[PDB]
Design a protein around this ligand. Sequence first.
Ligand SMILES: COc1cc(=O)[nH]c(=O)[nH]1
Length: 148
Amino acid sequence: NLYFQHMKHGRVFIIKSYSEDDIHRSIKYNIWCSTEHGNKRLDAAYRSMNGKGPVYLLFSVNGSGHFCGVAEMKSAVDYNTCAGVWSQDKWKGRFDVRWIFVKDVPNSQLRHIRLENNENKPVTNSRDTQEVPLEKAKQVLKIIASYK
Ligand SMILES: COc1cc(=O)[nH]c(=O)[nH]1
Protein backbone atom coordinates (compact mmCIF):
# COMPACT_ATOMS: atom_id res chain seq x y z
CA ASN A 1 0.00 0.00 0.00
CA LEU A 2 1.04 3.64 -0.39
CA TYR A 3 0.51 4.41 3.31
CA PHE A 4 2.83 3.80 6.31
CA GLN A 5 5.28 1.61 4.37
CA HIS A 6 8.19 3.24 6.24
CA MET A 7 7.63 3.12 10.02
CA LYS A 8 10.42 0.86 11.23
CA HIS A 9 10.40 2.30 14.76
CA GLY A 10 7.79 3.91 16.94
CA ARG A 11 4.65 3.03 18.74
CA VAL A 12 0.89 3.25 18.43
CA PHE A 13 -1.83 3.77 21.05
CA ILE A 14 -5.64 3.70 21.06
CA ILE A 15 -7.31 6.92 22.24
CA LYS A 16 -10.89 6.54 23.55
CA SER A 17 -13.00 9.64 24.19
CA TYR A 18 -16.30 10.26 25.98
CA SER A 19 -16.66 13.48 24.00
CA GLU A 20 -16.85 14.12 20.30
CA ASP A 21 -16.57 17.85 21.14
CA ASP A 22 -13.15 17.13 22.62
CA ILE A 23 -12.09 15.49 19.35
CA HIS A 24 -13.32 18.53 17.40
CA ARG A 25 -11.20 20.77 19.61
CA SER A 26 -8.20 18.45 19.17
CA ILE A 27 -8.54 18.68 15.39
CA LYS A 28 -8.96 22.46 15.50
CA TYR A 29 -5.98 23.22 17.75
CA ASN A 30 -3.77 20.12 17.30
CA ILE A 31 -3.60 19.24 21.01
CA TRP A 32 -4.81 16.42 23.24
CA CYS A 33 -4.92 15.34 26.88
CA SER A 34 -5.58 11.98 28.57
CA THR A 35 -6.06 10.82 32.15
CA GLU A 36 -3.09 11.17 34.45
CA HIS A 37 -2.25 7.49 33.93
CA GLY A 38 -2.69 7.73 30.16
CA ASN A 39 -0.64 10.93 29.97
CA LYS A 40 2.18 9.19 31.83
CA ARG A 41 2.05 6.23 29.43
CA LEU A 42 2.11 8.41 26.32
CA ASP A 43 4.75 10.72 27.81
CA ALA A 44 7.07 7.78 28.55
CA ALA A 45 6.66 6.43 25.02
CA TYR A 46 7.23 9.83 23.42
CA ARG A 47 10.33 10.62 25.49
CA SER A 48 11.89 7.17 25.13
CA MET A 49 11.35 7.47 21.37
CA ASN A 50 13.87 10.34 21.37
CA GLY A 51 12.63 11.39 17.94
CA LYS A 52 13.72 8.09 16.35
CA GLY A 53 10.20 7.26 15.15
CA PRO A 54 6.54 8.31 15.28
CA VAL A 55 4.11 7.87 18.15
CA TYR A 56 0.72 7.47 16.45
CA LEU A 57 -2.74 7.75 18.09
CA LEU A 58 -5.83 5.93 16.80
CA PHE A 59 -8.90 7.90 17.93
CA SER A 60 -12.37 6.54 18.64
CA VAL A 61 -15.41 8.00 20.38
CA ASN A 62 -16.87 5.64 23.01
CA GLY A 63 -19.99 3.93 21.69
CA SER A 64 -19.66 5.39 18.19
CA GLY A 65 -18.94 2.06 16.50
CA HIS A 66 -16.17 3.63 14.43
CA PHE A 67 -12.67 5.03 14.63
CA CYS A 68 -12.52 8.68 13.68
CA GLY A 69 -8.92 9.19 12.57
CA VAL A 70 -5.21 9.22 13.24
CA ALA A 71 -2.85 11.78 14.77
CA GLU A 72 0.86 11.85 15.53
CA MET A 73 2.02 12.83 18.98
CA LYS A 74 4.17 15.95 18.59
CA SER A 75 5.42 17.01 22.04
CA ALA A 76 6.00 15.79 25.55
CA VAL A 77 3.23 16.18 28.09
CA ASP A 78 2.85 19.49 29.90
CA TYR A 79 1.09 18.70 33.17
CA ASN A 80 0.49 22.29 34.40
CA THR A 81 -1.88 24.06 31.99
CA CYS A 82 -5.13 25.99 31.92
CA ALA A 83 -7.91 24.05 33.63
CA GLY A 84 -11.38 23.44 32.28
CA VAL A 85 -10.65 23.66 28.55
CA TRP A 86 -12.15 20.22 27.75
CA SER A 87 -15.61 18.74 28.20
CA GLN A 88 -14.69 17.79 31.77
CA ASP A 89 -12.28 19.35 34.25
CA LYS A 90 -10.75 15.90 34.91
CA TRP A 91 -8.58 16.11 31.75
CA LYS A 92 -5.57 18.04 33.12
CA GLY A 93 -2.53 18.90 30.98
CA ARG A 94 -1.71 19.11 27.30
CA PHE A 95 0.48 17.75 24.53
CA ASP A 96 0.69 18.65 20.87
CA VAL A 97 -0.54 16.35 18.11
CA ARG A 98 -0.70 16.53 14.33
CA TRP A 99 -3.84 15.07 12.80
CA ILE A 100 -3.16 12.96 9.70
CA PHE A 101 -6.53 11.40 8.86
CA VAL A 102 -9.92 12.71 9.93
CA LYS A 103 -12.38 10.07 8.76
CA ASP A 104 -14.87 7.63 10.21
CA VAL A 105 -13.94 3.98 9.72
CA PRO A 106 -16.53 1.42 10.91
CA ASN A 107 -15.37 -1.06 13.54
CA SER A 108 -16.43 -3.86 11.17
CA GLN A 109 -13.36 -3.03 9.07
CA LEU A 110 -10.99 -3.41 12.02
CA ARG A 111 -12.44 -5.93 14.50
CA HIS A 112 -10.62 -8.95 13.05
CA ILE A 113 -7.29 -7.44 14.16
CA ARG A 114 -6.48 -8.86 17.60
CA LEU A 115 -3.98 -7.64 20.19
CA GLU A 116 -1.65 -10.37 21.45
CA ASN A 117 -0.75 -8.04 24.33
CA ASN A 118 -4.43 -7.68 25.32
CA GLU A 119 -5.55 -11.31 25.64
CA ASN A 120 -6.03 -11.53 21.85
CA LYS A 121 -9.04 -9.16 22.12
CA PRO A 122 -10.19 -7.26 19.02
CA VAL A 123 -8.41 -3.92 18.63
CA THR A 124 -11.91 -2.39 18.51
CA ASN A 125 -12.44 -3.47 22.14
CA SER A 126 -9.51 -1.47 23.52
CA ARG A 127 -9.56 1.03 26.34
CA ASP A 128 -7.89 4.46 26.31
CA THR A 129 -4.07 4.40 25.77
CA GLN A 130 -4.06 0.65 25.05
CA GLU A 131 -0.77 0.17 23.18
CA VAL A 132 -0.98 -1.65 19.83
CA PRO A 133 1.80 -4.06 18.76
CA LEU A 134 3.63 -2.50 15.84
CA GLU A 135 2.65 -5.13 13.27
CA LYS A 136 -1.05 -4.92 14.20
CA ALA A 137 -0.79 -1.12 14.21
CA LYS A 138 0.48 -1.08 10.63
CA GLN A 139 -2.53 -3.14 9.57
CA VAL A 140 -4.93 -0.74 11.32
CA LEU A 141 -3.23 2.39 9.99
CA LYS A 142 -3.30 1.12 6.40
CA ILE A 143 -6.96 0.18 6.64
CA ILE A 144 -7.87 3.62 7.96
CA ALA A 145 -5.64 5.41 5.43
CA SER A 146 -7.14 3.61 2.42
CA TYR A 147 -10.77 3.29 3.53
CA LYS A 148 -13.42 4.82 1.30
C1 LIG B 1 -8.91 15.68 26.00
O1 LIG B 1 -10.28 15.45 26.17
C2 LIG B 1 -10.65 14.15 26.55
C3 LIG B 1 -9.63 13.13 26.93
C4 LIG B 1 -10.08 11.75 27.32
O2 LIG B 1 -9.28 10.93 27.63
N1 LIG B 1 -11.51 11.44 27.33
C5 LIG B 1 -12.51 12.47 26.95
O3 LIG B 1 -13.67 12.21 26.96
N2 LIG B 1 -12.05 13.83 26.56
